[PDB]
Amino acid sequence: FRKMAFPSGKVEGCMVQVTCGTTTLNGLWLDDVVYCPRAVICTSEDMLNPNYEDLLIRKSNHNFLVQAGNVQLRVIGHSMQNCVLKLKVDTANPKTPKYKFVRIQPGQTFSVLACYNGSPSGVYQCAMRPNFTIKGSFLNGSCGSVGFNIDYDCVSFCYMHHMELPTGVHAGTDLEGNFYGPFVDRQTAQAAGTDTTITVNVLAWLYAAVINGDRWFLNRFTTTLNDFNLVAMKYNYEPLTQDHVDILGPLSAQTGIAVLDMCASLKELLQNGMNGRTILGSALLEDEFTPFDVVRQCS
Amino acid sequence: FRKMAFPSGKVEGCMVQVTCGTTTLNGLWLDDVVYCPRAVICTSEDMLNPNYEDLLIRKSNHNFLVQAGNVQLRVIGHSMQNCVLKLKVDTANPKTPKYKFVRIQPGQTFSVLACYNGSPSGVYQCAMRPNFTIKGSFLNGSCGSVGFNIDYDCVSFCYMHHMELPTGVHAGTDLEGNFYGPFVDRQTAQAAGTDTTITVNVLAWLYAAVINGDRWFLNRFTTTLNDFNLVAMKYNYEPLTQDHVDILGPLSAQTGIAVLDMCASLKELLQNGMNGRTILGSALLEDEFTPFDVVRQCS
């Protein structure tokens, strides 16, 4: 039961360094476009109350230094899309993989290739919390690192790191520059909402327990989806959506245990204790394995 | 504070598929040699009691099918070094990185690139247990996957996966073909020695907890090295050497907490337990981060 990241090679060849003035961060080089956080055009003084439209007007193509390692790529156009800058460069990246941009839902997991100054440093797996933050490990110069999933031959880019919040959590955007959650890219007072437990992922973990023969928690009861959702909220668990019920389908089929029967088992675990017993060796429930993460064990 | 794996791109470009008869597994292609576990020449019947010298003399070059994606490599020659087969091929790998073969010690960590049929599937960080096994995620066909660290420009290969033990833990060799631990590449029931907890790594992880604002376990007391070691061995923890104390120095310096002071906190956790409290979100004492791993992620 390890947290497995996707192999990073396809993303490593797309990482570059973007500098404006003295501010350097990471960018993503796909075909002849470099994507990076628009905060790169800010001085430390600008960040307090930036006017990005104004700041960008006073920038030319020749104010941007884009580097692949030590090699400069000339910028031949620039535009702003929401909170990301798009820099058109003179060279199409020969390492561009098949890719697509995806906006994920809270609870989904992805790998993050943590980079400093365009140089890949490490890969880890994380989940998007329901309060749209990530409990992760990339402060200090990691702005612009991206999160991704690999869907056969295709890299789905889903996250671009922008900043750290006061409580140590990280916030960012999708690759269209739209923030996940109610945050803005300025050094102002910002707080995330209260974190909740990702119910669909706890269910995926209970199915994984059953698949491996750990099944003491199954009970003889069932529940309705509405009954379960109203009880879940009293324990700071996320309510289930119809999409969550659908993505648990393969695990329900594999084990023969209906989704709502498993909800009834979890509900009893929430009201009573776990009676000192473990599940998959753990006294705590895990909520950062998705249904798809779990099926990466049967295959 | 997550488990961070090394970027896998330099190793992904070296993975190939190797087939002999009906047996297919993963190989590592560096320069003009493919390294893979010698068990690839065995049938199901051979693995009961393989005489590897005899089996190899009975094979010819064309009995070996090597595939790098869709390109088939021609085998020129073949030789055995301990438990690894070295297949010479007529083409060098142009994506060969700067590399070294190293034998690691228990307690040290590395990244594993899990592959199936020569295709990279996931990357994760693990530790070599004191009993020379690794607790990992290896399904059928994962044989021949490698473990590695990266030192700037250099990939240090330290592990090649060979077999799963009846308890689910994994066993393998270095890249010279010598097993880690008292295991043999034969299909017979094999147990490992008793495992122990890697004390210096637990201490590193407690420093990480402190760095990250998790301090409930600290106390004002101190202990001596020998008095700590007496308690450690009682609880199946590795004893602490003076070398271990030196390696923890940078963490001691950054937190203002002397090593023997932290040892006194660990001793209390060993004796009283954690009593339903968590550290860095975990209910168990984590021992698969080295002091270097913690320093790398906390500076």
Coordinates of C-alpha atoms in Angstrom, one line a residue:
Chain A
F1 CA 0.0 0.0 0.0
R2 CA 2.5 2.6 -1.2
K3 CA 1.7 6.0 -2.7
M4 CA 3.0 5.6 -6.2
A5 CA 3.8 8.5 -8.5
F6 CA 3.7 8.5 -12.3
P7 CA 7.0 8.2 -14.1
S8 CA 8.1 11.8 -14.7
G9 CA 10.3 11.5 -17.9
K10 CA 7.7 12.9 -20.3
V11 CA 7.3 16.0 -18.1
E12 CA 11.0 16.5 -17.3
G13 CA 11.7 17.3 -20.9
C14 CA 9.2 20.1 -20.9
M15 CA 10.5 22.1 -17.8
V16 CA 12.2 25.5 -18.4
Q17 CA 13.2 28.5 -16.4
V18 CA 11.5 31.9 -16.9
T19 CA 13.0 35.1 -15.6
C20 CA 11.7 38.6 -15.7
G21 CA 14.1 41.1 -14.0
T22 CA 15.3 39.3 -11.0
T23 CA 12.3 37.0 -10.5
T24 CA 12.9 33.4 -11.7
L25 CA 10.4 30.6 -11.6
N26 CA 9.5 27.4 -13.5
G27 CA 7.6 27.2 -16.8
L28 CA 6.2 24.5 -19.0
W29 CA 7.3 24.2 -22.6
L30 CA 4.9 22.5 -25.0
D31 CA 5.2 23.0 -28.8
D32 CA 6.2 26.6 -29.2
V33 CA 4.5 28.0 -26.0
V34 CA 5.8 28.4 -22.5
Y35 CA 3.2 28.5 -19.7
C36 CA 4.1 30.0 -16.3
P37 CA 2.6 31.9 -13.4
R38 CA 1.9 35.6 -14.3
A39 CA 3.5 36.6 -11.0
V40 CA 6.9 36.4 -12.7
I41 CA 6.4 40.0 -13.9
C42 CA 6.2 41.3 -10.3
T43 CA 8.8 42.7 -8.1
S44 CA 8.6 41.7 -4.4
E45 CA 7.1 45.2 -3.9
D46 CA 4.5 44.8 -6.7
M47 CA 3.1 41.6 -5.1
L48 CA 1.2 43.5 -2.4
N49 CA -1.3 45.0 -4.7
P50 CA -0.5 44.2 -8.3
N51 CA -2.3 45.5 -11.4
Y52 CA -1.3 42.7 -13.8
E53 CA -2.9 44.4 -16.8
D54 CA -0.9 47.6 -16.1
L55 CA 2.3 45.7 -15.3
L56 CA 2.1 43.6 -18.5
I57 CA 1.5 46.6 -20.8
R58 CA 5.0 47.9 -19.8
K59 CA 6.6 44.6 -20.8
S60 CA 8.0 43.6 -24.2
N61 CA 9.0 40.2 -25.6
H62 CA 12.6 41.2 -24.9
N63 CA 12.0 41.5 -21.1
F64 CA 11.5 37.8 -20.7
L65 CA 14.4 35.3 -20.3
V66 CA 13.4 31.7 -21.1
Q67 CA 16.0 29.0 -20.6
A68 CA 16.1 25.3 -21.2
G69 CA 19.1 24.5 -19.0
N70 CA 21.7 27.1 -20.1
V71 CA 20.1 27.6 -23.6
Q72 CA 18.0 30.7 -24.2
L73 CA 14.7 30.4 -26.2
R74 CA 13.8 33.8 -27.8
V75 CA 10.3 35.1 -26.9
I76 CA 8.4 36.2 -29.9
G77 CA 5.0 36.9 -28.3
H78 CA 3.2 37.1 -25.0
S79 CA -0.3 37.1 -23.7
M80 CA -2.0 36.6 -20.3
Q81 CA -4.8 34.1 -19.8
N82 CA -6.3 34.5 -16.3
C83 CA -3.4 33.9 -13.9
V84 CA -1.0 32.3 -16.4
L85 CA 1.3 33.9 -18.9
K86 CA 1.7 32.3 -22.3
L87 CA 5.1 33.0 -23.9
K88 CA 5.4 32.2 -27.5
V89 CA 9.0 31.1 -28.3
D90 CA 10.9 30.6 -31.5
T91 CA 11.5 26.8 -31.0
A92 CA 8.9 24.0 -30.9
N93 CA 9.9 21.6 -28.1
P94 CA 11.0 18.3 -29.8
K95 CA 10.2 16.5 -26.5
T96 CA 6.6 17.6 -26.5
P97 CA 4.5 14.6 -25.5
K98 CA 0.9 13.9 -26.4
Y99 CA -0.9 16.0 -23.8
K100 CA -4.1 17.7 -22.8
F101 CA -5.2 20.2 -20.1
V102 CA -7.7 18.9 -17.5
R103 CA -9.4 20.6 -14.5
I104 CA -9.7 18.0 -11.7
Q105 CA -12.2 17.7 -8.9
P106 CA -11.2 17.8 -5.3
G107 CA -10.3 14.3 -4.1
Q108 CA -8.5 13.4 -7.3
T109 CA -4.8 12.6 -7.1
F110 CA -1.9 13.5 -9.4
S111 CA 1.9 13.5 -9.4
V112 CA 3.8 16.8 -8.9
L113 CA 7.3 17.2 -10.5
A114 CA 8.9 19.6 -8.0
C115 CA 11.4 21.8 -9.8
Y116 CA 13.7 24.6 -8.7
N117 CA 15.0 27.0 -11.4
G118 CA 13.8 24.7 -14.2
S119 CA 15.7 21.8 -12.8
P120 CA 13.6 18.7 -11.8
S121 CA 14.2 17.8 -8.1
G122 CA 11.7 15.1 -7.1
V123 CA 8.3 13.6 -7.8
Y124 CA 5.5 12.9 -5.4
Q125 CA 1.9 11.9 -5.3
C126 CA -0.7 14.1 -3.7
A127 CA -4.5 14.7 -3.6
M128 CA -6.4 17.9 -4.1
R129 CA -8.1 18.5 -0.7
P130 CA -11.8 19.5 -0.6
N131 CA -10.7 23.0 0.5
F132 CA -8.7 23.2 -2.8
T133 CA -5.3 23.2 -1.2
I134 CA -2.6 20.5 -1.3
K135 CA -0.7 19.3 1.7
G136 CA 2.6 19.1 -0.2
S137 CA 6.3 19.7 -0.1
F138 CA 7.3 22.5 -2.5
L139 CA 7.9 25.9 -1.0
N140 CA 10.7 28.2 -2.0
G141 CA 11.3 28.6 -5.7
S142 CA 9.0 25.8 -6.7
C143 CA 6.4 28.2 -8.2
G144 CA 5.5 27.0 -11.6
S145 CA 5.9 23.3 -11.0
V146 CA 3.1 21.2 -12.6
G147 CA 0.9 18.3 -11.5
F148 CA -0.1 15.6 -14.0
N149 CA -1.6 12.2 -14.6
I150 CA -0.6 9.8 -17.4
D151 CA -3.5 8.3 -19.3
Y152 CA -1.8 5.6 -21.4
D153 CA 0.2 7.6 -24.0
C154 CA -1.2 11.0 -23.0
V155 CA 0.0 13.4 -20.2
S156 CA -3.0 15.2 -18.6
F157 CA -1.7 18.4 -17.0
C158 CA -4.0 19.4 -14.2
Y159 CA -2.1 21.8 -11.8
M160 CA 0.4 24.6 -11.8
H161 CA 1.8 25.7 -8.4
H162 CA 1.5 29.3 -7.5
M163 CA 1.9 30.0 -3.8
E164 CA 1.9 28.9 -0.2
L165 CA -0.8 29.8 2.2
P166 CA -0.3 30.9 5.8
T167 CA -1.1 27.5 7.2
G168 CA 1.6 25.8 5.1
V169 CA -0.7 24.5 2.4
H170 CA -0.2 25.1 -1.3
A171 CA -2.5 26.7 -3.9
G172 CA -2.4 26.9 -7.7
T173 CA -4.3 26.9 -10.9
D174 CA -5.2 24.7 -13.8
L175 CA -3.3 25.1 -17.0
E176 CA -5.9 27.7 -18.2
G177 CA -4.8 29.9 -15.3
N178 CA -8.0 29.5 -13.2
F179 CA -7.4 29.0 -9.5
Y180 CA -8.5 26.0 -7.7
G181 CA -10.5 27.5 -4.8
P182 CA -11.1 31.1 -3.7
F183 CA -7.6 32.3 -3.9
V184 CA -5.9 35.2 -5.8
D185 CA -2.2 35.6 -6.8
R186 CA -1.4 38.6 -4.6
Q187 CA 0.3 38.7 -1.2
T188 CA -2.8 39.4 0.7
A189 CA -4.6 37.8 3.7
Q190 CA -5.9 34.5 2.5
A191 CA -7.2 31.4 4.4
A192 CA -8.5 28.1 3.2
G193 CA -11.8 26.7 4.3
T194 CA -11.9 23.8 6.8
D195 CA -10.5 20.6 5.3
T196 CA -12.9 17.6 5.2
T197 CA -12.3 13.9 4.7
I198 CA -12.5 12.7 1.1
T199 CA -15.4 10.1 1.4
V200 CA -15.1 8.5 -2.0
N201 CA -11.4 7.8 -1.4
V202 CA -12.1 6.3 2.0
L203 CA -14.6 4.0 0.3
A204 CA -12.0 3.0 -2.3
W205 CA -9.6 2.1 0.5
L206 CA -12.3 0.0 2.2
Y207 CA -12.8 -1.9 -1.1
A208 CA -9.0 -2.4 -1.3
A209 CA -9.1 -3.9 2.2
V210 CA -11.9 -6.3 1.1
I211 CA -10.0 -7.3 -2.0
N212 CA -7.0 -8.3 0.1
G213 CA -9.1 -10.3 2.6
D214 CA -9.6 -7.7 5.4
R215 CA -13.3 -7.6 5.8
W216 CA -14.4 -7.6 9.4
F217 CA -16.1 -4.2 9.1
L218 CA -18.7 -5.3 6.6
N219 CA -22.2 -5.3 8.2
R220 CA -25.6 -6.7 7.2
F221 CA -27.2 -3.3 6.6
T222 CA -27.6 -0.8 3.8
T223 CA -28.5 2.9 3.6
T224 CA -29.7 5.5 1.2
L225 CA -27.4 8.0 -0.5
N226 CA -29.3 10.9 1.1
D227 CA -29.3 9.3 4.6
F228 CA -25.5 8.7 4.3
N229 CA -24.7 12.2 3.0
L230 CA -26.5 13.9 5.9
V231 CA -24.7 11.7 8.4
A232 CA -21.3 12.2 6.7
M233 CA -21.5 16.0 7.1
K234 CA -21.9 15.6 10.9
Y235 CA -18.5 13.9 10.9
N236 CA -16.7 16.4 8.6
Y237 CA -16.8 14.0 5.7
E238 CA -17.6 15.1 2.1
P239 CA -21.0 14.1 0.8
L240 CA -21.0 11.7 -2.2
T241 CA -21.9 12.8 -5.7
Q242 CA -23.4 10.6 -8.4
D243 CA -20.0 10.7 -10.1
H244 CA -18.4 9.2 -7.0
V245 CA -20.9 6.4 -7.0
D246 CA -20.2 5.7 -10.6
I247 CA -16.4 5.6 -10.3
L248 CA -16.7 3.1 -7.4
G249 CA -18.5 0.8 -9.8
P250 CA -15.6 -1.4 -10.9
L251 CA -14.6 -2.0 -7.3
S252 CA -18.2 -2.8 -6.4
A253 CA -18.4 -5.2 -9.3
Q254 CA -15.0 -6.9 -8.4
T255 CA -16.0 -7.5 -4.8
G256 CA -19.7 -8.0 -5.3
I257 CA -20.4 -5.4 -2.5
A258 CA -22.9 -2.6 -3.5
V259 CA -21.7 1.0 -3.0
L260 CA -24.5 1.8 -0.6
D261 CA -23.7 -1.4 1.4
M262 CA -20.2 -0.1 1.8
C263 CA -21.5 3.3 2.8
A264 CA -23.5 1.5 5.6
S265 CA -20.3 -0.1 6.8
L266 CA -18.4 3.2 6.9
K267 CA -21.3 4.9 8.6
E268 CA -21.0 2.3 11.5
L269 CA -17.3 3.0 11.7
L270 CA -18.0 6.7 12.0
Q271 CA -20.7 6.4 14.8
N272 CA -18.9 3.7 16.8
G273 CA -15.1 3.5 16.9
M274 CA -12.8 1.1 15.2
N275 CA -12.7 -0.8 18.4
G276 CA -8.9 -0.8 18.3
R277 CA -8.9 -3.0 15.2
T278 CA -6.9 -2.1 12.1
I279 CA -7.7 -2.0 8.4
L280 CA -4.8 -2.9 6.1
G281 CA -2.7 -2.7 9.2
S282 CA -3.7 0.9 9.9
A283 CA -5.6 2.4 12.9
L284 CA -6.5 5.4 10.8
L285 CA -8.5 5.6 7.6
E286 CA -6.7 6.7 4.5
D287 CA -8.3 9.2 2.1
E288 CA -5.7 9.9 -0.6
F289 CA -6.1 6.8 -2.7
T290 CA -8.7 7.2 -5.5
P291 CA -10.7 4.3 -7.0
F292 CA -8.3 4.4 -9.9
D293 CA -5.2 4.4 -7.6
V294 CA -6.7 1.2 -6.0
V295 CA -7.3 -0.5 -9.4
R296 CA -3.5 0.0 -9.9
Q297 CA -3.1 -3.1 -7.8
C298 CA -5.3 -5.6 -9.7
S299 CA -3.4 -4.4 -12.7
Chain B
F1 CA 6.0 16.1 4.4
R2 CA 5.7 13.4 1.7
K3 CA 7.9 10.6 0.5
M4 CA 9.8 12.2 -2.4
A5 CA 11.1 10.0 -5.3
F6 CA 13.8 11.0 -7.7
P7 CA 12.8 12.1 -11.2
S8 CA 12.7 8.9 -13.3
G9 CA 13.3 10.1 -16.8
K10 CA 17.0 9.2 -17.0
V11 CA 16.1 5.6 -16.0
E12 CA 13.0 5.3 -18.2
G13 CA 15.1 5.7 -21.3
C14 CA 17.1 2.6 -20.3
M15 CA 14.3 0.1 -19.7
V16 CA 13.7 -2.7 -22.2
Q17 CA 11.8 -6.0 -22.4
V18 CA 13.7 -9.3 -22.5
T19 CA 12.1 -12.6 -23.5
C20 CA 13.5 -16.1 -23.5
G21 CA 11.1 -18.9 -24.3
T22 CA 7.9 -18.2 -22.5
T23 CA 9.6 -16.0 -19.8
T24 CA 9.4 -12.2 -20.2
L25 CA 10.8 -9.6 -17.7
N26 CA 12.4 -6.2 -17.5
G27 CA 16.0 -5.4 -18.5
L28 CA 18.3 -2.4 -18.1
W29 CA 20.1 -1.2 -21.3
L30 CA 23.3 0.8 -20.7
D31 CA 25.8 1.4 -23.4
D32 CA 25.8 -1.9 -25.4
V33 CA 24.8 -4.3 -22.6
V34 CA 21.3 -5.4 -21.3
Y35 CA 21.3 -6.4 -17.6
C36 CA 18.5 -8.6 -16.4
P37 CA 17.8 -11.3 -13.8
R38 CA 19.3 -14.7 -14.9
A39 CA 16.0 -16.4 -14.0
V40 CA 14.8 -15.3 -17.5
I41 CA 16.4 -18.5 -18.9
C42 CA 14.4 -20.8 -16.6
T43 CA 11.1 -22.5 -17.3
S44 CA 8.6 -23.1 -14.5
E45 CA 10.1 -26.5 -14.1
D46 CA 13.7 -25.2 -14.0
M47 CA 13.0 -22.7 -11.2
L48 CA 12.5 -25.6 -8.7
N49 CA 16.3 -26.3 -8.8
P50 CA 18.1 -24.4 -11.6
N51 CA 21.7 -25.3 -12.5
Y52 CA 22.3 -21.9 -14.1
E53 CA 25.7 -22.8 -15.6
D54 CA 24.1 -25.7 -17.5
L55 CA 21.0 -23.8 -18.6
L56 CA 23.1 -20.9 -20.0
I57 CA 25.4 -23.1 -22.1
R58 CA 22.3 -24.7 -23.7
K59 CA 21.0 -21.2 -24.8
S60 CA 22.1 -19.4 -28.0
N61 CA 22.1 -15.7 -28.8
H62 CA 18.9 -16.0 -30.9
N63 CA 17.1 -17.6 -27.9
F64 CA 17.1 -14.0 -26.5
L65 CA 14.5 -11.5 -27.7
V66 CA 15.3 -7.9 -26.6
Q67 CA 12.8 -5.1 -27.4
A68 CA 13.2 -1.3 -26.7
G69 CA 9.6 -0.3 -27.3
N70 CA 9.0 -1.6 -30.8
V71 CA 12.7 -1.8 -32.0
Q72 CA 14.2 -5.3 -31.6
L73 CA 17.8 -5.4 -30.5
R74 CA 20.1 -8.2 -31.8
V75 CA 22.0 -10.1 -29.1
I76 CA 25.7 -10.4 -30.0
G77 CA 26.9 -12.3 -26.9
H78 CA 25.9 -13.2 -23.4
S79 CA 27.5 -13.9 -20.0
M80 CA 26.5 -14.4 -16.4
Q81 CA 27.8 -12.4 -13.4
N82 CA 26.4 -13.9 -10.2
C83 CA 22.6 -13.6 -10.5
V84 CA 22.5 -11.1 -13.4
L85 CA 22.6 -11.9 -17.1
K86 CA 24.6 -9.5 -19.3
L87 CA 23.4 -9.5 -22.9
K88 CA 25.6 -7.7 -25.4
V89 CA 23.6 -6.1 -28.2
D90 CA 24.7 -4.6 -31.5
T91 CA 23.6 -1.1 -30.7
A92 CA 24.5 1.2 -27.8
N93 CA 21.8 3.1 -25.9
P94 CA 22.0 6.7 -27.0
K95 CA 20.1 7.7 -23.8
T96 CA 22.7 6.1 -21.5
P97 CA 23.1 8.5 -18.6
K98 CA 26.2 9.0 -16.6
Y99 CA 26.0 6.1 -14.1
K100 CA 27.6 4.0 -11.4
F101 CA 26.8 0.7 -9.8
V102 CA 26.7 0.9 -6.0
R103 CA 25.8 -1.6 -3.2
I104 CA 23.8 0.2 -0.5
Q105 CA 23.5 -0.5 3.2
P106 CA 20.3 -1.3 5.1
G107 CA 18.6 1.9 6.3
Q108 CA 19.5 3.8 3.1
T109 CA 16.7 4.9 0.7
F110 CA 16.3 4.8 -3.1
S111 CA 13.7 5.2 -5.8
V112 CA 12.3 2.2 -7.6
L113 CA 11.0 2.5 -11.1
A114 CA 8.3 -0.2 -11.3
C115 CA 8.0 -1.6 -14.8
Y116 CA 6.0 -4.2 -16.6
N117 CA 7.0 -5.8 -20.0
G118 CA 9.7 -3.1 -20.3
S119 CA 7.3 -0.2 -19.8
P120 CA 7.6 2.2 -16.9
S121 CA 4.5 2.2 -14.6
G122 CA 5.3 4.0 -11.4
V123 CA 8.0 5.4 -9.2
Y124 CA 8.2 5.3 -5.4
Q125 CA 10.8 5.7 -2.6
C126 CA 11.7 2.8 -0.3
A127 CA 14.3 1.8 2.2
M128 CA 16.5 -1.3 2.4
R129 CA 15.2 -2.9 5.6
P130 CA 17.8 -4.1 8.1
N131 CA 16.8 -7.7 7.2
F132 CA 17.6 -7.0 3.5
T133 CA 14.1 -7.0 2.1
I134 CA 12.1 -4.1 0.8
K135 CA 8.4 -3.5 1.5
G136 CA 7.1 -2.5 -1.9
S137 CA 4.5 -2.7 -4.7
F138 CA 5.6 -5.3 -7.2
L139 CA 3.1 -7.3 -9.2
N140 CA 3.7 -10.2 -11.6
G141 CA 6.2 -9.2 -14.4
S142 CA 7.9 -6.5 -12.2
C143 CA 11.0 -8.6 -12.1
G144 CA 14.1 -6.7 -13.4
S145 CA 12.8 -3.3 -12.3
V146 CA 15.7 -1.2 -10.8
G147 CA 16.3 1.0 -7.8
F148 CA 18.4 4.1 -8.0
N149 CA 19.5 7.4 -6.5
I150 CA 20.6 10.5 -8.5
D151 CA 23.6 12.6 -7.5
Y152 CA 23.4 15.6 -9.8
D153 CA 24.6 14.3 -13.2
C154 CA 25.0 10.7 -12.0
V155 CA 22.5 7.8 -11.6
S156 CA 23.6 5.3 -9.0
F157 CA 21.9 2.0 -9.6
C158 CA 21.7 0.0 -6.4
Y159 CA 19.0 -2.6 -6.8
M160 CA 17.4 -5.0 -9.3
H161 CA 14.2 -6.7 -8.3
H162 CA 14.1 -10.5 -8.4
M163 CA 11.4 -12.1 -6.4
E164 CA 8.6 -11.7 -3.9
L165 CA 8.9 -13.7 -0.7
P166 CA 5.9 -15.6 0.8
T167 CA 5.2 -12.7 3.2
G168 CA 4.8 -10.2 0.3
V169 CA 8.1 -8.4 0.9
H170 CA 10.6 -8.2 -2.0
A171 CA 14.2 -9.4 -2.5
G172 CA 16.8 -8.6 -5.1
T173 CA 20.4 -8.0 -6.0
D174 CA 22.8 -5.2 -6.7
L175 CA 23.8 -4.7 -10.3
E176 CA 26.8 -7.0 -9.9
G177 CA 24.3 -9.8 -9.3
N178 CA 24.9 -10.3 -5.5
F179 CA 21.7 -10.7 -3.5
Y180 CA 21.0 -8.4 -0.6
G181 CA 20.4 -10.8 2.2
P182 CA 20.6 -14.6 2.5
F183 CA 18.3 -15.4 -0.5
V184 CA 18.7 -17.4 -3.6
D185 CA 17.1 -17.2 -7.1
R186 CA 15.3 -20.5 -6.9
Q187 CA 11.6 -21.2 -6.4
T188 CA 11.6 -22.5 -2.8
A189 CA 10.1 -21.1 0.4
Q190 CA 12.3 -18.5 1.9
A191 CA 11.9 -16.4 5.1
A192 CA 13.8 -13.3 6.0
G193 CA 15.5 -12.6 9.4
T194 CA 13.7 -10.6 12.0
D195 CA 13.3 -7.0 11.0
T196 CA 14.3 -4.0 13.2
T197 CA 13.4 -0.3 13.2
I198 CA 15.9 2.0 11.7
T199 CA 16.6 4.3 14.7
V200 CA 18.6 7.1 13.0
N201 CA 15.8 7.5 10.4
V202 CA 13.1 7.7 13.1
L203 CA 15.2 10.5 14.7
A204 CA 15.5 12.3 11.3
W205 CA 11.7 12.1 11.0
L206 CA 11.1 13.5 14.5
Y207 CA 13.3 16.5 13.5
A208 CA 11.1 17.0 10.4
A209 CA 8.0 16.9 12.7
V210 CA 9.6 19.7 14.8
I211 CA 10.6 21.7 11.8
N212 CA 7.0 21.5 10.7
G213 CA 5.5 22.6 14.0
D214 CA 4.7 19.2 15.5
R215 CA 6.3 19.3 19.0
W216 CA 4.0 17.6 21.5
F217 CA 6.5 14.7 22.0
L218 CA 9.4 16.8 23.2
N219 CA 10.6 17.0 26.8
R220 CA 13.2 18.8 28.8
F221 CA 15.3 15.8 29.6
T222 CA 18.4 14.4 28.0
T223 CA 20.0 10.9 28.0
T224 CA 23.3 9.3 27.3
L225 CA 24.1 7.4 24.1
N226 CA 24.6 4.1 26.0
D227 CA 21.5 4.5 28.1
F228 CA 19.4 5.3 25.0
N229 CA 20.9 2.3 23.2
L230 CA 19.9 -0.1 26.1
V231 CA 16.3 0.9 25.7
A232 CA 16.4 0.9 21.9
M233 CA 17.6 -2.7 21.7
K234 CA 14.9 -3.8 24.1
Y235 CA 12.4 -2.6 21.6
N236 CA 14.0 -4.0 18.5
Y237 CA 15.5 -0.7 17.3
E238 CA 18.9 -0.5 15.8
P239 CA 21.5 0.9 18.1
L240 CA 22.8 4.4 17.5
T241 CA 26.5 5.0 16.6
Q242 CA 28.5 8.2 17.0
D243 CA 28.5 8.3 13.2
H244 CA 24.7 8.5 13.4
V245 CA 24.9 11.4 15.8
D246 CA 27.2 13.4 13.5
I247 CA 24.9 12.9 10.5
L248 CA 22.0 14.3 12.5
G249 CA 24.1 17.5 13.2
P250 CA 22.5 19.7 10.6
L251 CA 19.1 18.9 11.9
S252 CA 20.2 19.5 15.4
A253 CA 21.6 22.8 14.3
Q254 CA 18.5 24.0 12.5
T255 CA 16.1 23.1 15.4
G256 CA 18.2 24.0 18.4
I257 CA 17.5 20.5 19.8
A258 CA 20.5 18.4 20.7
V259 CA 20.5 14.8 19.4
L260 CA 20.7 13.2 22.8
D261 CA 17.8 15.5 23.8
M262 CA 15.7 14.1 20.9
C263 CA 16.8 10.6 21.9
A264 CA 15.2 11.2 25.3
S265 CA 11.9 12.1 23.6
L266 CA 12.1 8.9 21.5
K267 CA 12.9 6.8 24.6
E268 CA 9.6 8.1 26.2
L269 CA 7.6 7.3 23.0
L270 CA 9.1 3.8 23.1
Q271 CA 8.1 3.2 26.7
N272 CA 4.7 5.0 27.0
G273 CA 3.5 4.7 23.4
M274 CA 1.9 7.4 21.4
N275 CA -1.6 7.0 23.0
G276 CA -3.7 7.7 19.9
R277 CA -1.7 10.9 19.1
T278 CA -0.2 11.4 15.7
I279 CA 3.1 12.8 14.4
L280 CA 3.1 14.5 11.0
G281 CA -0.3 12.8 10.5
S282 CA 1.0 9.3 11.1
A283 CA 0.1 6.9 13.9
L284 CA 3.3 5.0 13.6
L285 CA 6.9 6.0 14.0
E286 CA 8.2 6.3 10.4
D287 CA 11.7 5.0 9.6
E288 CA 12.0 5.3 5.8
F289 CA 13.4 8.8 5.7
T290 CA 17.2 9.2 6.1
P291 CA 18.7 12.3 7.6
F292 CA 19.8 13.3 4.0
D293 CA 16.2 12.8 2.8
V294 CA 14.9 15.1 5.5
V295 CA 17.6 17.7 4.9
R296 CA 17.0 17.7 1.2
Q297 CA 13.3 18.4 1.7
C298 CA 13.7 20.9 4.6
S299 CA 16.4 23.2 3.0

